[PDB]
Amino acid sequence: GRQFGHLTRVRHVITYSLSPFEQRAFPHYFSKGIPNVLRRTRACILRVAPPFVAFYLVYTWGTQEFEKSKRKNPA
Amino acid sequence: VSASSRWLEGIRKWYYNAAGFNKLGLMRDDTIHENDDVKEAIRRLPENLYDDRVFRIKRALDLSMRQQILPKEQWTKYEEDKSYLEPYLKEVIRERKEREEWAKK
Amino acid sequence: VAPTLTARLYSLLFRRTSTFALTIVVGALFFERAFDQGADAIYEHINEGKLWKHIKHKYEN
Amino acid sequence: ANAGDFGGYYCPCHGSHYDASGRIRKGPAPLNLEVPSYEFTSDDMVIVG
Amino acid sequence: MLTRFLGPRYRQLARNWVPTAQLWGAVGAVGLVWATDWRLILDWVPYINGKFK
Amino acid sequence: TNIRKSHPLMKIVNNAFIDLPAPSNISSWWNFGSLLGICLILQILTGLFLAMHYTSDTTTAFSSVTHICRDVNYGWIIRYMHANGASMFFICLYMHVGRGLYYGSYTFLETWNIGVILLLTVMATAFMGYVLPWGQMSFWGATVITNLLSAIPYIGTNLVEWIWGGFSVDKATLTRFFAFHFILPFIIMAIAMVHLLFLHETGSNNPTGISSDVDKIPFHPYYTIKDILGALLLILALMLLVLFAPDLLGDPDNYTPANPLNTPPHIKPEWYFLFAYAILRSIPNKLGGVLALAFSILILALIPLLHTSKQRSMMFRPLSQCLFWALVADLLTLTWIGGQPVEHPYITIGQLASVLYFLLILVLMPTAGTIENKLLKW
Numbered sequence: 001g002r003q004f005g006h007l008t009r010v011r012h013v014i015t016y017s018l019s020p021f022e023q024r025a026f027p028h029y030f031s032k033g034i035p036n037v038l039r040r041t042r043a044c045i046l047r048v049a050p051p052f053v054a055f056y057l058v059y060t061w062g063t064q065e066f067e068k069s070k071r072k073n074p075a
Numbered sequence: 076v077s078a079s080s081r082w083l084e085g086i087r088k089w090y091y092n093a094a095g096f097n098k099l100g101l102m103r104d105d106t107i108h109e110n111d112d113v114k115e116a117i118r119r120l121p122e123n124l125y126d127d128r129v130f131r132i133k134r135a136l137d138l139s140m141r142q143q144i145l146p147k148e149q150w151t152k153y154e155e156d157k158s159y160l161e162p163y164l165k166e167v168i169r170e171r172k173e174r175e176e177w178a179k180k
Numbered sequence: 181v182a183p184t185l186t187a188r189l190y191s192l193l194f195r196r197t198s199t200f201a202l203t204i205v206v207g208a209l210f211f212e213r214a215f216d217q218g219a220d221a222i223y224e225h226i227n228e229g230k231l232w233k234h235i236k237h238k239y240e241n
Numbered sequence: 242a243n244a245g246d247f248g249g250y251y252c253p254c255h256g257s258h259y260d261a262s263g264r265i266r267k268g269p270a271p272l273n274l275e276v277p278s279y280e281f282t283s284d285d286m287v288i289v290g
Numbered sequence: 291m292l293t294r295f296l297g298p299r300y301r302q303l304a305r306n307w308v309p310t311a312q313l314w315g316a317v318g319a320v321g322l323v324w325a326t327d328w329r330l331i332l333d334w335v336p337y338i339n340g341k342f343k
Numbered sequence: 344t345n346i347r348k349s350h351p352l353m354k355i356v357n358n359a360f361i362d363l364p365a366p367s368n369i370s371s372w373w374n375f376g377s378l379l380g381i382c383l384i385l386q387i388l389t390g391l392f393l394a395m396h397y398t399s400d401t402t403t404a405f406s407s408v409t410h411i412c413r414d415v416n417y418g419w420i421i422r423y424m425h426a427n428g429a430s431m432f433f434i435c436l437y438m439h440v441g442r443g444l445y446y447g448s449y450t451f452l453e454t455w456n457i458g459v460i461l462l463l464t465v466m467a468t469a470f471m472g473y474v475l476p477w478g479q480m481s482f483w484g485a486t487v488i489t490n491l492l493s494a495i496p497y498i499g500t501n502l503v504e505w506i507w508g509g510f511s512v513d514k515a516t517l518t519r520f521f522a523f524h525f526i527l528p529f530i531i532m533a534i535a536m537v538h539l540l541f542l543h544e545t546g547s548n549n550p551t552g553i554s555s556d557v558d559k560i561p562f563h564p565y566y567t568i569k570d571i572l573g574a575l576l577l578i579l580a581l582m583l584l585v586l587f588a589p590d591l592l593g594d595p596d597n598y599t600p601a602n603p604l605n606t607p608p609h610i611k612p613e614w615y616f617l618f619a620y621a622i623l624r625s626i627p628n629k630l631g632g633v634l635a636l637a638f639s640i641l642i643l644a645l646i647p648l649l650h651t652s653k654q655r656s657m658m659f660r661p662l663s664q665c666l667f668w669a670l671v672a673d674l675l676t677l678t679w680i681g682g683q684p685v686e687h688p689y690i691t692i693g694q695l696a697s698v699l700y701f702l703l704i705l706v707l708m709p710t711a712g713t714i715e716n717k718l719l720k721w
């Protein structure tokens with residue numbers, strides 16, 4: 001279902017738009033663009049990054065213990 | 076009242092800021108998940124609040140689309156954050172719970 | 181012992197869909213056996229070429 | 242053959258360690274390796290089955 | 291929060307549906323038994339001893 | 344009236360890809376639904392062309408697969424597109440499920456539950472796929488797997504022998520697996536349509552988890568082209584894999600013909616089951632291992648009952664985000680461990696990671712939602 005004209009009630013909202021043939025597809029692409037990705041990165045590192053390094057560490061340690069274990073000195 | 080309450084209050088303020096709905100000009104109640112109780116409370120809102128709530132959601136979905144965010148001064152400030160829905164939601168729940176009590180006897 | 185007969189079947193077993201089902205399932209079990217043996221024996225009589233001969237060859241094992 | 246903690250058998254799929262009698266000692270294997278029905282017809286021959 | 295379904299009416303409801311839930315289970319059982327030919331369960335039934343021993 | 348809107352056949356198209364009101368803010372993460380759509384068709388098309396030369400007999404199975412790569416014109420790409428597409432199908436599948444979890448999309452019960460059936464089905468499908476070339480890994484993979492079912496009390500031995508068609512993974516077993524691997528993707532498709540049917544009752548969710556009726560756009564310029572750009576990105580990934588590293592995700596041993604006497608020291612699944620494999624062998628029990636193996640997948644059906652937060656998405660929930668990323672990180676660990684022998688480090692870390700997987704989904708994530716509600720005074 002769904003349709004358009006039966007979704008919900010909206011009042012007093014104007015929407016100015018401009019035709020795609022009158023504007024640029026990539027406005028300040030590098031100018032405003034890159035700052036935004038850095039800002040999006042800041043916003044999320046502390047939530048995405050840590051779990052992963054914990055694995056990165058568990059992975060390298062895990063490998064070292066295993067390979068070092070199949071060796072032996074006395075007895 | 077003292078040191079402790081402010082500490083729980085500042086922890087709450089901290090979560091709020093971290094939660095980040097404020098950055099999209101949203102208010103806490105604009106983020107509530109819509110179940111029946113909630114759908115009814117939205118319905119019961121007065122004209123003004125209802126209209127303001129749609130503009131906020133629209134402002135946010137738009138921002139969320141181009142993955143931008145509002146200038147810092149326009150973020151909603153914690154505890155200037157009017158919980159407009161709460162009293163309505165509370166009553167709708169209270170009404171449902173009474174129906175539920177009656178349904179047991 | 182005739183009008184009251186299908187009447188009892190309905191009263192005691194067909195009214196509820198519970199019993200109705202239970203009865204056809206209990207009824208499927210016995211029927212399977214009775215139809216199988218009963219039809220095997222009809223297939224058995226019209227023939228007598230297969231393993232009726234078994235009595236001979238075997239036993240000597 | 243000749244692998245594992247018990248000098249018998251080792252199953253690489255989930256870590257089943259067996260001894261020289263075929264008994265399970267480590268890992269998730271529920272029973273000992275099945276001993277087939279067998280007999281010796283002489284000092285140099287064995288008929289399994 | 292399933293405390294919504296706890297009260298006298300629901301307790302009356304449960305009882306009214308027991309003979310039915312019980313008879314549905316008898317249907318399911320015999321139905322399972324007869325369909326797989328449950329050796330263990332079947333061998334006890336008087337007739338239907340089509341597995342001799 | 345129009346033609347699109349009124350015609351019985353076109354209506355369906357119109358209501359699903361043209362005038363469908365879509366949220367204006369869905370991001371890549373929403374592309375994996377169409378990408379799974381493409382992967383499904385790609386798997387069917389290359390899958391059919393392979394079936395035009397493949398033989399389902401142990402005598403010629405491997406040879407026919409070889410016949411395809413050397414002799415059949417362009418048989419090799421078709422074969423690698425198939426193989427690599429199966430992996431692409433799992434990368435997309437995993438993005439899709441994860442997207443649903445992070446964003447609260449699972450609240451659409453029927454859609455999601457149908458999605459679980461779709462996951463199981465392509466899994467059952469891909470497992471049978473891998474056995475077809477009759478390589479050492481095909482046979483021993485087929486062996487290790489099916490035999491799990493023998494842990495089911497009183498019925499397990501008869502069940503395993505029933506699907507085997509003997510006492511081993513033999514002739515009967517290969518042909519069998521061909522037939523099921525042929526019919527399964529069609530059934531998947533009928534289910535993908537029912538999936539999309541239920542999805543249509545509400546329309547899509549979005550990153551904020553807040554309703555978007557207030558700002559919907561037609562699927563008609565916006566998401567047709569965004570799906571297009573995205574399929575092109577799926578092609579890049581797939582083609583990069585097949586035209587430069589066709590065995591990278593493959594096991595060099597499935598290249599040695601099946602030998603029912605030669606057990607490779609290796610013995611591991613295709614990467615997409617490695618996490619479940621790790622969970623399975625973490626348990627020093629036959630029944631429990633397979634009981635928990637199953638539960639590591641069927642748990643997706645418990646997720647909606649464990650939603651505890653007053654918000655739908657995770658966009659506004661930090662504590663929950665951390666727990667989510669720890670789930671993904673824990674799933675890397677699980678696959679990594681699953682691809683490693685059951686000797687030192689590996690046993691105890693893969694054992695604890697298994698506990699964590701279930702502690703996370705079953706206890707930690709819900710508890711976080713309650714805490715978050717509380718911090719918000721909700």
Ligand code: HEM
Pocket residue numbers: 372373374375376377379380383436439440443446448449451454455456457458459460461462465531535538539542546547548549643
């Ligand atoms: C043959 C496998 C699948 C196909 C073809 C399929 C196809 C799709 C399509 C086309 C969409 C709409 C666009 C999108 O959000 O991506 C979608 C959304 C969804 N699917 Fe699937 N999907 C499949 C597997 C799954 C799985 C494995 C699950 C999880 C158990 C799942 C649960 C969902 C849910 C909940 C949504 C709604 C997401 C939202 O709107 O935010 N589906 N799917």
Ligand code: HEM
Pocket residue numbers: 386387388389390391393394397408422425426427428429430432465468469470472473474475476524525526528529
């Ligand atoms: C009905 C459409 C399909 C057909 C007709 C089909 C047919 C085949 C045939 C004949 C083989 C053996 C040839 C070979 O190994 O290259 C095969 C292998 C395989 N297929 Fe399919 N299949 C289809 C859909 C799928 C699906 C849905 C998947 C799951 C993503 C899938 C994943 C596999 C895998 C993993 C292999 C073994 C790996 C390999 O390529 O060597 N295929 N398929």
Ligand SMILES: COC1=C(OC)C(=O)C(C/C=C(/C)CCC=C(C)C)=C(C)C1=O
Pocket residue numbers: 463466467470473483484485487488610611612613616619620623636637640
């Ligand atoms: C021999 O190598 C192996 C595979 O490759 C052939 C696998 O695929 C899997 C896991 C496969 C499945 C289907 C688990 C899902 C079970 C249920 C009930 C959903 C394992 C454990 C494995 O050891």
Ligand SMILES: COC1=C(OC)C(=O)C(C/C=C(\C)CCC=C(C)C)=C(C)C1=O
Pocket residue numbers: 359363364365366369373374376377380381383532535536539542547562566570
């Ligand atoms: C508004 O949200 C939606 C999208 O934007 C994220 C999509 O991209 C698609 C794409 C689905 C397609 C092309 C159908 C494929 C299915 C099969 C069986 C081939 C759907 C349905 C949708 O609802």
